[PDB]
Amino acid sequence: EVQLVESGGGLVQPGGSLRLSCAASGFIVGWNYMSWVRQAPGKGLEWVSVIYPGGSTYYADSVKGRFTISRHNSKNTLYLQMNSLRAEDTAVYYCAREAYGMDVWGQGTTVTVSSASTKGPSVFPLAPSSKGGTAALGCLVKDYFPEPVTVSWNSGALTSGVHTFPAVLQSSGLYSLSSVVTVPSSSLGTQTYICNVNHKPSNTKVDKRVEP
Amino acid sequence: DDIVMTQSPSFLSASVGDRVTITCRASQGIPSSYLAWYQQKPGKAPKLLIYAASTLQSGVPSRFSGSGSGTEFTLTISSLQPEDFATYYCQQLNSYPPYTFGQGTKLEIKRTVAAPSVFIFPPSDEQLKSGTASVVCLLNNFYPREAKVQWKVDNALQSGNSQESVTEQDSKDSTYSLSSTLTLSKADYEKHKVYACEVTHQGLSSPVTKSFNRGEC
Amino acid sequence: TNLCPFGEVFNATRFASVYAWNRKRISNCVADYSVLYNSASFSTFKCYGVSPTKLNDLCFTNVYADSFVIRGDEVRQIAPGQTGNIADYNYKLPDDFTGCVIAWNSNNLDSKVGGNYNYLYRLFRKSNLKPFERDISTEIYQAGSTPCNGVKGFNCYFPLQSYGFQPTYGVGYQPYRVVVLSFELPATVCGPK
Ligand SMILES: *[C@@H]1O[C@H](CO)[C@@H](O)[C@H](O)[C@H]1NC(C)=O
């Protein structure tokens, strides 16, 4: 028990709406200071909203008039209704109880606001160029949406020396990612190197051969 | 007007058994009951460590101690342990909103200085067919995290058309790896000859430039 | 023996905590309202429903002087239509409040180095106060299904939190003394007329 399980996050266009649900067990939602705190990709924690046990509700300045916090007494559930969703609202959202400091948190749910359609990536080879005797080779997983994308090398057989980087959101609103691996130079002419990219949201599996 | 929480440092390096101090400062003198300390691993929710600026949250180890008052507060991990390597936030609960967090402090593993391996990757022919060229500079297995990457196109210092990202500290050598993409249109790419990336790091006495001439083998 | 004993309320050397706010009933006397306002040493002097000056010619059956101490930012909560910890759970003015709210900084009186823990306020309460309601309960707050039976613990909190006024606080966190005058209606408290 004593958990907070959230749901309702997903994908919406700017100006869309979501309604986050947060189910509590172990305490009573209506009897506590219940708060919503979000966290952008790679950023810190920002408090979003709070409902008092007595009923009063207070919102972060950047969400006033677009977000409304509520609760169902029966289902013991906190709610965050998000209208006119700006792209800046893209974050992991958490509900929490505040007794003296926020002692019970939830697993979170992801809200993504964008006007881009779902798209699989193009996989391009970062071929071993002039680059001790260590060659670098990789794949550029470009122009996909939404997150995420998983990359393996040689069907999982090659794991040593792999570095798969966090994606970067581009000005287009699509994501670009890099997966490199370092091998001995003598290995370049003997063993074949294939990168495997899985993009579940658009349901695309790509195997690209990398060679100099 | 409002209360601003400011944390020091933003990144912190230490070893197991080391003693660690994280500092939080307030834009105003505030009651000490206001602020709490939270811990966060990657991909996971914050865990409340300390509240009322010194009271230890139930179930949290004794090595965590909070102190301070007025405008200065401190989280102190007495004997660092492998499971304490995470990000740490301070937070003031104002009893009238907003509630404000610190910028956070990433507590990383201290290791000796290691210089990066630097590789340049010219755009692929497959991508060039599509009307975009993206050059990729890779910095491999370096420490500490702070490194500067400068793109040079015909010796012009390029700004605004590049993006970078960093892996987390590696699980077995405690290094970082950085990737930088410089993106251009095809025509713009063909309007230049020399493409280079210049890396400055602690373990590098001189900056290292890795370059190539477009359309050469 | 004619003049209303406003010095007893205003000039008193110690004030109640906001949760146990004090009420002095005032009847059969004359109220200056010139000495009160025109000695404007108050950080706040707001009058809802009545002009602050040109008030000491009007008669009432009795007037109530409620006094307490809050922190500086919380003075703005002492007004009709406000919400917050003090308004919801310590002192609620009615939506149609007719009277005056007066407040002044008292850092030099109520802040001790190391914190003054005498002044408290109700942190935990299930419902908002009715207007002019006083709650002086110290029963453990039950935030969960498990009854507390008067012990602190998980989901079991003491309802009152101390201000801990240190003189080094921000001015919005320094002590602030507040007197709320309510006028209520044979009228016998009058001004000089
Ligand atoms: C409070 O005391 C001062 C000092 O004697 C006096 O001047 C002032 O009139 C008093 N105020 C009231 C309301 O009695």
Q: Does A101 touch chain C (CB under 8 A)?
A: no
Answer for the pair A145, A114: CB distance below 8 angstroms, yes or no: yes
Largest CA distance in chain B: 67
The CA-atom distances, in angstroms, between A194 and each of A210, B114, C118 are 6, 29, 72
Instruction: Please tell me the distance from the alpha carbon of residue A66 to that of residue B160, in angstroms, as a whole number.
Output: 33
Which CATH superfamily, name and number, covers A3-113? Immunoglobulins (2.60.40.10)
Tokens representing B45 are 């929710």
From the list A26, A31, A52, the residue facing C88 with the nearest CB is A52
Tell me if C10 CB under 6 Å of ligand 1.
Answer: yes
Phi first, then psi, for residue C65 (nearest 5°) are -110, 105
Cα-Cα-Cα-Cα dihedral of B81, B87, B88, B94, to 10°?
-160
* C109, containing H or E segment: helix C107-110
Q: How many beta-carbon pairs below 8 A join chains A and C?
A: 35
**Pick from B200, B111, B198, B205: which is nearest to B155 by CA?**
B198
State the pairing for strand pair A109-113/A11-12. parallel
**Per-position DSSP letters for B185-213, written without gaps between them:** EHHHHHT--EEEEEEE-TT-SS-EEEEEE
3-class DSSP state of B165: strand
Instruction: Please tell me the distance from the alpha carbon of residue A31 to that of residue C125, in angstroms, as a whole number.
Output: 8
Fold topology of A122-210: Immunoglobulin-like (2.60.40)
Q: Does A27 touch chain C (CB under 8 A)?
A: yes
Phi first, then psi, for residue B214 (nearest 5°) are -60, 135
From the list B29, B30, B96, the residue facing C84 with the nearest CB is B96
Answer for the pair B149, B139: CB distance below 8 angstroms, yes or no: yes
Task: Report the neighbours of C using a cutoff of 3 or more CB pairs below 8 angstroms.
Answer: A, B
**DSSP percent split of chain C into helix, strand, coil, nearest 5:** 15, 30, 60
Instruction: Please tell me the distance from the alpha carbon of residue A138 to that of residue A183, in angstroms, as a whole number.
Output: 11
Instruction: Please tell me the distance from the alpha carbon of residue B121 to that of residue B211, in angstroms, as a whole number.
Output: 9
Q: What is the resolution of this structure in A?
A: 2.9
Tell me if C37 CB under 6 Å of ligand 1.
Answer: no
Q: Write down the domain spans for chain A.
A: 3-113, 122-210
Q: Is the dihedral of CA A179, A184, A185, A187 positive or negative?
A: negative
Through-space distance between the first and last CA atoms of chain B, rounded to whole angstroms = 62
Which residue, by CA, sits nearest to atom 11 of ligand 1? C7
Q: ∠ at Cα C176 (C47, A102), nearest 5°?
A: 110
Answer for the pair A51, A101: CB distance below 8 angstroms, yes or no: no
The CA-atom distances, in angstroms, between A146 and each of A84, A119, B177, C56 are 20, 7, 24, 71
> Which residue out of C4, C9, C10, C11 has the highest number of ligand 1 atoms within 8 Å of its CB and is therefore the one to mutate?
C11
Instruction: Please tell me the distance from the alpha carbon of residue A204 to that of residue A118, in angstroms, as a whole number.
Output: 11
Instruction: Please tell me the distance from the alpha carbon of residue C13 to that of residue C11, in angstroms, as a whole number.
Output: 6
Task: Quickly tell me which residue has 């949250």 as its tokens.
Answer: B57
Q: Ramachandran region of residue A154, left (φ > 0), alpha (ψ -120 to 50) or beta?
A: left
Task: Tell me how long chain B is.
Answer: 217
DSSP H helices in chain A: none
Phi first, then psi, for residue C17 (nearest 5°) are -65, 155
Instruction: Please tell me the distance from the alpha carbon of residue A165 to that of residue A179, in angstroms, as a whole number.
Output: 6
Instruction: Please tell me the distance from the alpha carbon of residue A141 to that of residue B195, in angstroms, as a whole number.
Output: 21
Burial class from Cβ neighbours inside 10 Å (0-12, 13-18, 19+) for residue C171 reads middle
Q: Which residues have C-beta within 8 Å of that of residue A65, sequence separation ≥ 6?
A: none
Q: ∠ at Cα B76 (B75, B78), nearest 5°?
A: 160
A24 to chain C: closest CA residue: C144
**Pick from A78, A93, A94, A80: which is nearest to A34 by CA?**
A78
Answer for the pair A48, A62: CB distance below 8 angstroms, yes or no: no
Q: Does C13 touch chain A (CB under 8 A)?
A: no
**Per-position DSSP letters for B80-146, written without gaps between them:** --GGG-SEEEEEE--SSSPPEE---EEEEE----BPPEEEEEPPPHHHHTTTEEEEEEEEEEEBSS-
Count the neighbouring beta carbons within 10 Å of the beta carbon of residue B206.
6
A122-210 and A3-113 share a CATH fold: yes
Which residue, by CA, sits nearest to atom 9 of ligand 1? C35
State the pairing for strand pair B132-142/B148-153. unpaired
Q: Which domains does chain B possess?
A: 5-109 (2.60.40.10), 117-213 (2.60.40.10)
State the pairing for strand pair B117-121/B72-77. unpaired
Instruction: Please tell me the distance from the alpha carbon of residue B73 to that of residue C110, in angstroms, as a whole number.
Output: 24
Chain C residues near any Cβ of chain B (below 8 Å)? 73-74, 84-85, 123, 154, 161-164, 166, 168-170, 172-173
Quote the ligand 1 centre to C11 CA distance (angstroms): 6
Answer for the pair A127, A100: CB distance below 8 angstroms, yes or no: no
Instruction: Please tell me the distance from the alpha carbon of residue A79 to that of residue A95, in angstroms, as a whole number.
Output: 9
Tokens representing B192 are 């230049």
Instruction: Please tell me the distance from the alpha carbon of residue C122 to that of residue C19, in angstroms, as a whole number.
Output: 6
For B78, half-sphere exposure in the C-beta direction (CA atoms, 13 angstrom radius) is 7
Answer for the pair B149, B138: CB distance below 8 angstroms, yes or no: no
Task: Report the neighbours of A using a cutoff of 3 or more CB pairs below 8 angstroms.
Answer: B, C
**Pick from B48, B5, B3, B2: which is nearest to B24 by CA?**
B5
Task: Quickly tell me which residue has 């040593």 as its tokens.
Answer: A160
Task: Tell me how long chain A is.
Answer: 212
**Pick from C122, B64, B58: which is nearest to A103 by CA?**
B58
Task: Tell me how long chain C is.
Answer: 193
Contact across the interface for A56 and C142, Cβ inside 8 Å: no
Count the neighbouring beta carbons within 10 Å of the beta carbon of residue A23.
17
CB environment A51-88: b (16+ within 10 A), e (fewer): bbbbebbbbbeebeebbbbebeeeebbbbbebeebeee
Q: Does C84 touch chain A (CB under 8 A)?
A: yes
Chain C residue numbers with beta carbons less than 8 Å from the beta carbon of B70 are 166, 168
Tokens representing B13 are 């390096």
Contact across the interface for A55 and C128, Cβ inside 8 Å: yes
Count the neighbouring beta carbons within 10 Å of the beta carbon of residue B25.
16
Kindly provide the residue ranges of all beta strands, DSSP E only, lying in chain C, ordered along the sequence: 22-26, 44-48, 62-71, 99-105, 120-122, 141-142, 156-157, 160-162, 175-184
Q: Which domains does chain C possess?
A: 6-134+161-184 (3.30.70.1840)
Instruction: Please tell me the distance from the alpha carbon of residue B193 to that of residue C58, in angstroms, as a whole number.
Output: 91
